PDB file of C-alpha atoms (C1' of nucleotides) in Angstrom:
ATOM      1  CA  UNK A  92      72.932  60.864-129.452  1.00  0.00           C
ATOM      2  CA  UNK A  93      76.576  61.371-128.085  1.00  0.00           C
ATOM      3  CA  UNK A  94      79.465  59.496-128.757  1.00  0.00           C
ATOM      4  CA  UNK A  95      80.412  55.631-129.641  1.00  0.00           C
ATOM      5  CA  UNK A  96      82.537  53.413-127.152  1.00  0.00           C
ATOM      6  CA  UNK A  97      85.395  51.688-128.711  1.00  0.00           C
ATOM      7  CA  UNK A  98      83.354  48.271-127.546  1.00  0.00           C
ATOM      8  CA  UNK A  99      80.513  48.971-129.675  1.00  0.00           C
ATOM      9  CA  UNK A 100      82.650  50.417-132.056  1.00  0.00           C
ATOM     10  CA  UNK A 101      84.842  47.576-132.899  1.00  0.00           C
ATOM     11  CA  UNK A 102      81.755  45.825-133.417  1.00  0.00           C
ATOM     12  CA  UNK A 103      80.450  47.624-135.405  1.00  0.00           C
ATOM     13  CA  UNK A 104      83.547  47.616-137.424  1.00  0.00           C
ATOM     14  CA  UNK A 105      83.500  43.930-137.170  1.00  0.00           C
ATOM     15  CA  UNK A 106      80.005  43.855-138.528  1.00  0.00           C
ATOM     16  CA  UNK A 107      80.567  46.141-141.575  1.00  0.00           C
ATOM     17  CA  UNK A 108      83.562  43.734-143.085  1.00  0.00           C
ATOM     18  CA  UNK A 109      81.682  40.575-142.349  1.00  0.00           C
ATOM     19  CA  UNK A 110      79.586  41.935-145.270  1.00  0.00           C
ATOM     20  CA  UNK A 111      82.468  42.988-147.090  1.00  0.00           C
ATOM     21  CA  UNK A 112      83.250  39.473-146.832  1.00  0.00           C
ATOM     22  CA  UNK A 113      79.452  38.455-147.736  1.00  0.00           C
ATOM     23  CA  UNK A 114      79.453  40.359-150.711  1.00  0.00           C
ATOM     24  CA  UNK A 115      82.580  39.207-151.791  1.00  0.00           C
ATOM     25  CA  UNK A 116      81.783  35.694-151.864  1.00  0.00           C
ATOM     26  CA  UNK A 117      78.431  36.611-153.368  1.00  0.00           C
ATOM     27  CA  UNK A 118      80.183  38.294-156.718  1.00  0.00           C
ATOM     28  CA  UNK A 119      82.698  35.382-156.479  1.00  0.00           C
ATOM     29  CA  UNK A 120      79.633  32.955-156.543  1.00  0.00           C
ATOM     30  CA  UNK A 121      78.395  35.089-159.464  1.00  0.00           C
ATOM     31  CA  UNK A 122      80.663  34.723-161.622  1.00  0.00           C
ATOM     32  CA  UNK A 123      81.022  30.989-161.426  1.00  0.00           C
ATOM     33  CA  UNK A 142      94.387  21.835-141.252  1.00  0.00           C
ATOM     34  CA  UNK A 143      96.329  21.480-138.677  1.00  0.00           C
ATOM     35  CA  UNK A 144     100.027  20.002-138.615  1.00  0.00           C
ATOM     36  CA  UNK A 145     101.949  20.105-134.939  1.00  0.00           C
ATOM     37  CA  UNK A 146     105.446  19.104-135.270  1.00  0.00           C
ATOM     38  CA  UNK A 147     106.156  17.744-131.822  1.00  0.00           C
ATOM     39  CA  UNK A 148     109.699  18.432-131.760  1.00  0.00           C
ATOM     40  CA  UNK A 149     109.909  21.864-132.170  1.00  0.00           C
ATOM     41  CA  UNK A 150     106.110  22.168-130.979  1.00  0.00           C
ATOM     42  CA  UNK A 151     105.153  24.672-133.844  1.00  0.00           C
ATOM     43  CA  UNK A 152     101.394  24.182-135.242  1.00  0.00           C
ATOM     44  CA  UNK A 153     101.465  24.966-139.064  1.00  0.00           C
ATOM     45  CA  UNK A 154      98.665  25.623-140.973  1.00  0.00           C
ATOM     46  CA  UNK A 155      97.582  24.788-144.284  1.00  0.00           C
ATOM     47  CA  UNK A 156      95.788  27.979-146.105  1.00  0.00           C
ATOM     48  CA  UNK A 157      94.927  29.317-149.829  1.00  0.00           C
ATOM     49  CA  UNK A 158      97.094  31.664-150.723  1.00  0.00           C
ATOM     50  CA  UNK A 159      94.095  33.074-152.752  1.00  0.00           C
ATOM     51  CA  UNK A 160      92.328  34.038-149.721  1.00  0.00           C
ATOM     52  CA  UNK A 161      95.795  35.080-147.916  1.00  0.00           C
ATOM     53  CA  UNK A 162      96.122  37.197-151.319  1.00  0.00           C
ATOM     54  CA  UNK A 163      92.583  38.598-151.029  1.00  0.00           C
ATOM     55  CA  UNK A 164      93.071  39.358-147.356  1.00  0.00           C
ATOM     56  CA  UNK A 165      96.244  41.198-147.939  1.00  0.00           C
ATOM     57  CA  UNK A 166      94.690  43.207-151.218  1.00  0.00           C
ATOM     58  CA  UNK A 167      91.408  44.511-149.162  1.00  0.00           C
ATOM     59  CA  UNK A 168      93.155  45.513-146.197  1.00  0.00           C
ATOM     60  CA  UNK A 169      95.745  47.758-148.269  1.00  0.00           C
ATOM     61  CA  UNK A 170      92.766  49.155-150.274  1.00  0.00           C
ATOM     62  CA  UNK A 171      90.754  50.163-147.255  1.00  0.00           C
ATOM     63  CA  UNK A 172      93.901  51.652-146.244  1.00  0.00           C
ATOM     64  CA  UNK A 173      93.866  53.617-149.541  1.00  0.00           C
ATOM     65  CA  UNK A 174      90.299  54.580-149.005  1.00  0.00           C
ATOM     66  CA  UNK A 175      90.745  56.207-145.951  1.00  0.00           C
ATOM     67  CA  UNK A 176      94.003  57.857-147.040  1.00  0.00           C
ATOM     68  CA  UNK A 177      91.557  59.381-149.815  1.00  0.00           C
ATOM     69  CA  UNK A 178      88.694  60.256-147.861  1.00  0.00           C
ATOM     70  CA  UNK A 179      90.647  61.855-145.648  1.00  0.00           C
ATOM     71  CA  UNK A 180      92.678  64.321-147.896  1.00  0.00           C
ATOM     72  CA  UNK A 181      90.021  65.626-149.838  1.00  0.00           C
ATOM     73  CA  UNK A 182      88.811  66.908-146.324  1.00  0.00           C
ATOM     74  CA  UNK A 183      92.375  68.116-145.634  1.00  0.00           C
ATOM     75  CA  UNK A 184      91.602  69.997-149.297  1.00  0.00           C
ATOM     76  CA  UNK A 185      87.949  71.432-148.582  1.00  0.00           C
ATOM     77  CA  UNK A 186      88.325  71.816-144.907  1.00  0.00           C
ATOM     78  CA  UNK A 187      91.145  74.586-146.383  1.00  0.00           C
ATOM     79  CA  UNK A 188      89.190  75.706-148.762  1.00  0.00           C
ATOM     80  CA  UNK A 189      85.920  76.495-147.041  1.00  0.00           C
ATOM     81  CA  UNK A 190      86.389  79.023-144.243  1.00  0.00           C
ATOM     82  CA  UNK A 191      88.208  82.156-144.291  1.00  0.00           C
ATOM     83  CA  UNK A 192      86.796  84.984-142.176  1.00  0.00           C
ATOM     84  CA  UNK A 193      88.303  85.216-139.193  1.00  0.00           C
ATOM     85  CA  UNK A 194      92.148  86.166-138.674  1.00  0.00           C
ATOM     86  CA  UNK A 195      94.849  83.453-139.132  1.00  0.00           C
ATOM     87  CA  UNK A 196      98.281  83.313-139.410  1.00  0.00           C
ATOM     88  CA  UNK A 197      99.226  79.577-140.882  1.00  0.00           C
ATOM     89  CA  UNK A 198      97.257  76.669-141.293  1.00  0.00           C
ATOM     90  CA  UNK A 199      98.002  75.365-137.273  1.00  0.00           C
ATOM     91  CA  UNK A 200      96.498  78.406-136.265  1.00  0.00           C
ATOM     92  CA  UNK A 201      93.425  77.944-138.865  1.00  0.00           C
ATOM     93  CA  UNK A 202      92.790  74.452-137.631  1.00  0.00           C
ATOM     94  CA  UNK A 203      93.186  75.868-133.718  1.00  0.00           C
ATOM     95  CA  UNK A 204      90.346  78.153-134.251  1.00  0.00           C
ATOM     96  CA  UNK A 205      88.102  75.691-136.261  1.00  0.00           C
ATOM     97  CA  UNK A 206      88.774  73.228-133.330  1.00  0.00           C
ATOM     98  CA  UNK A 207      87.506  76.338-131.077  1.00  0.00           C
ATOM     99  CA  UNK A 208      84.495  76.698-133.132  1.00  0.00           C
ATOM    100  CA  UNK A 209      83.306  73.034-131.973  1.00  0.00           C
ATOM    101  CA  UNK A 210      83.756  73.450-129.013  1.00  0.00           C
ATOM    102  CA  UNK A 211      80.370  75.695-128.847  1.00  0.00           C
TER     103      UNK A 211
ATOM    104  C1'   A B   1      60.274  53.842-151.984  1.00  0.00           C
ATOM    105  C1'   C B   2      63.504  48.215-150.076  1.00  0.00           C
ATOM    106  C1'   G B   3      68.807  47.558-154.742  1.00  0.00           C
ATOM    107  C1'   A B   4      74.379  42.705-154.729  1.00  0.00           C
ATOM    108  C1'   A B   5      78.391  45.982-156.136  1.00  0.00           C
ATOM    109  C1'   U B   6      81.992  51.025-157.619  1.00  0.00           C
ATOM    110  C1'   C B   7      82.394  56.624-158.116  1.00  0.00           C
ATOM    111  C1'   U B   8      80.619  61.448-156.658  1.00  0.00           C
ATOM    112  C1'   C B   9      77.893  64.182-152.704  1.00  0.00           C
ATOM    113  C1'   U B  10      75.130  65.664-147.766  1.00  0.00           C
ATOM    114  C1'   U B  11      74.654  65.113-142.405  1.00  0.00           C
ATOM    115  C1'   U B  12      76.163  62.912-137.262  1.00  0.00           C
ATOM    116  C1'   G B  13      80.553  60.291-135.056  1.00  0.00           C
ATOM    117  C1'   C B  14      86.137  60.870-135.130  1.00  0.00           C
ATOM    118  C1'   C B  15      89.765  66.183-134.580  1.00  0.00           C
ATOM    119  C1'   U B  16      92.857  63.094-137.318  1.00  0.00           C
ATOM    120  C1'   U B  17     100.061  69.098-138.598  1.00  0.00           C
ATOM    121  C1'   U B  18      94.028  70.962-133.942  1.00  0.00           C
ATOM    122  C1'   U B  19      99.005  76.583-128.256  1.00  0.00           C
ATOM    123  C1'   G B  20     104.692  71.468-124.535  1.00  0.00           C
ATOM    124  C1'   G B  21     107.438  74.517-117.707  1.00  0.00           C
ATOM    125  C1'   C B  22     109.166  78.162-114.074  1.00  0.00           C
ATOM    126  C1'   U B  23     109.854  83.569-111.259  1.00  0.00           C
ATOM    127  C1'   U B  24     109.912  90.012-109.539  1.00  0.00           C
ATOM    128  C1'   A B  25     103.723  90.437-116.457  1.00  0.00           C
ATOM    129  C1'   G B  26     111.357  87.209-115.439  1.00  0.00           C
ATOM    130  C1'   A B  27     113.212  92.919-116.168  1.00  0.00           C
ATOM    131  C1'   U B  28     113.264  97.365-119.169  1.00  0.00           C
ATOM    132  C1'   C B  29     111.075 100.899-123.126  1.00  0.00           C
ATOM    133  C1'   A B  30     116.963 106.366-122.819  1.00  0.00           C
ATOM    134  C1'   A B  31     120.452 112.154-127.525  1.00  0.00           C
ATOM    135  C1'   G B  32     125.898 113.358-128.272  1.00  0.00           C
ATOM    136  C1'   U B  33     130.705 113.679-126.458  1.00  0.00           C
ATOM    137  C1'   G B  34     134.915 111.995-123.385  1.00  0.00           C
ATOM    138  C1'   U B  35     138.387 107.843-121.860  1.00  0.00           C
ATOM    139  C1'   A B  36     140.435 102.572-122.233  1.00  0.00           C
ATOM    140  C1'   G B  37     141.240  97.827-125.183  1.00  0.00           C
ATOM    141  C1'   U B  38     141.377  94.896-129.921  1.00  0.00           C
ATOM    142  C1'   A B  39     141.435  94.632-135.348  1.00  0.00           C
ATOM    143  C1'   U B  40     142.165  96.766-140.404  1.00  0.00           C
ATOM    144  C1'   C B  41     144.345 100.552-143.818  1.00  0.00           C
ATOM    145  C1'   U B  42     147.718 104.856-144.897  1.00  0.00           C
ATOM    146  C1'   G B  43     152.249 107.971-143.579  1.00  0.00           C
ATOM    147  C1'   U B  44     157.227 108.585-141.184  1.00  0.00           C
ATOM    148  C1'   U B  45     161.613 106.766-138.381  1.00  0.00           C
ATOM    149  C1'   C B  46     164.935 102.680-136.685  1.00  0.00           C
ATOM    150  C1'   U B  47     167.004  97.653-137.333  1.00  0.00           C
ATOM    151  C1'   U B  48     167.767  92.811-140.039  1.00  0.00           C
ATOM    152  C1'   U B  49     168.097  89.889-144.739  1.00  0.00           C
ATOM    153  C1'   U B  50     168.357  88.684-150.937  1.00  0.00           C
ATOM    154  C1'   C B  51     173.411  89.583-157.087  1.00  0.00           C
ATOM    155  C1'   A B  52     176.874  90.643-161.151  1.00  0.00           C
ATOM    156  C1'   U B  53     180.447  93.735-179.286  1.00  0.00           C
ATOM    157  C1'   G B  54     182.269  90.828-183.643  1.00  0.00           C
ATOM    158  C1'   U B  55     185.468  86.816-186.016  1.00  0.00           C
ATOM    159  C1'   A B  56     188.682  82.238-185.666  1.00  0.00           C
ATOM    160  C1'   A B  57     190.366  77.508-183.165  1.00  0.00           C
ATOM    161  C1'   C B  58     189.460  73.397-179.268  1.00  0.00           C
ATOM    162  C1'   A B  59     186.411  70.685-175.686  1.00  0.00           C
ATOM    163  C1'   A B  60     181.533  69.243-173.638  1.00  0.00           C
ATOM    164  C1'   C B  61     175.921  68.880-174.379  1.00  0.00           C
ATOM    165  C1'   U B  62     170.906  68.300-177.709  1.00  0.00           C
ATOM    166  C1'   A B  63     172.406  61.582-170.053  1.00  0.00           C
ATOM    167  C1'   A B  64     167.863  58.991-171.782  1.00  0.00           C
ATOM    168  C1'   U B  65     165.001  55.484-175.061  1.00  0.00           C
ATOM    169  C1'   G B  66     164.647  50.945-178.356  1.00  0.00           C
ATOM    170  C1'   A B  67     166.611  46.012-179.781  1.00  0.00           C
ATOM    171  C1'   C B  68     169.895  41.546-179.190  1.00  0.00           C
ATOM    172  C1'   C B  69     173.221  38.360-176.014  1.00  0.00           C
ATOM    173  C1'   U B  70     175.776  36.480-171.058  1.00  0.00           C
ATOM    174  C1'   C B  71     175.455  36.079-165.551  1.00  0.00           C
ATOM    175  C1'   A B  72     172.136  36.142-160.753  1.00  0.00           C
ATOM    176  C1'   G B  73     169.422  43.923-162.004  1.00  0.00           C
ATOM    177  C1'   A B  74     174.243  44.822-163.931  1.00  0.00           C
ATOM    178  C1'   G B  75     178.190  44.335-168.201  1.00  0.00           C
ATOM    179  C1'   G B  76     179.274  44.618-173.592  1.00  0.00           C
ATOM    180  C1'   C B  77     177.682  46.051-178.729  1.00  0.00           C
ATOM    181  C1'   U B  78     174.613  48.771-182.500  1.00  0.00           C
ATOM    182  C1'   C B  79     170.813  52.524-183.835  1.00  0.00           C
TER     183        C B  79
END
RNA sequence: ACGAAUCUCUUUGCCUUUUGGCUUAGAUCAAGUGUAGUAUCUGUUCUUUUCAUGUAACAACUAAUGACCUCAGAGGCUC
């Protein structure tokens, strides 16, 4: 049991959207360089700007989706326990915090 | 009882608005009246300071506005 390092983590995290990236291409598939200007030394690269598109839509919508799975616990975690005294909702999430810690 | 995806739900992980010093626990757990000072309101006294009928005849007012012309705003004329 116990806890996850932020190594194995990250790789994990790494693993999860290389098949969001899988999957992707697989209902895309369903349906149907390098330039180094020496003067100024900057490399420019050539890119879709479908895939920089697609890149900038997922990331925003996994940003959603944790914006949404987290405040529907904000709204139950409120909503579930009630029996011992409280004064606001910092001291209700004080006393919940004490409860896992045994 | 193994779905390639979306939503809803359960459990672990994450705690994600999740107690921000000090010292003699920093110190104490007590009725009315009397006096002094400031402020407001009322009363009295003293002083100072703010003005000047009717009729007839004559004169002024209802300076400003509009327009035209000359000179480089003023001058003249009419309404």
């Amino acid at each position: 049991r116990g806890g996850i390092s932020y190594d194995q983590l990250a790789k994990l995290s790494y693993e999860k959207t290389l098949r969001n990236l899988a999957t992707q291409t697989q209902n895309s598939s369903k349906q149907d360089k390098v330039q180094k200007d020496t003067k100024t030394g900057k490399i420019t690269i050539a890119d879709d700007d479908k895939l920089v598109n697609k890149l900038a839509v997922s990331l925003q919508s996994e940003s959603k989706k944790r914006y949404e799975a987290r405040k529907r616990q904000m709204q139950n975690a409120k909503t579930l326990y009630g029996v011992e005294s409280f004064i606001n909702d910092k001291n209700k999430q004080f006393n919940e915090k004490l409860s896992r810690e045994s």
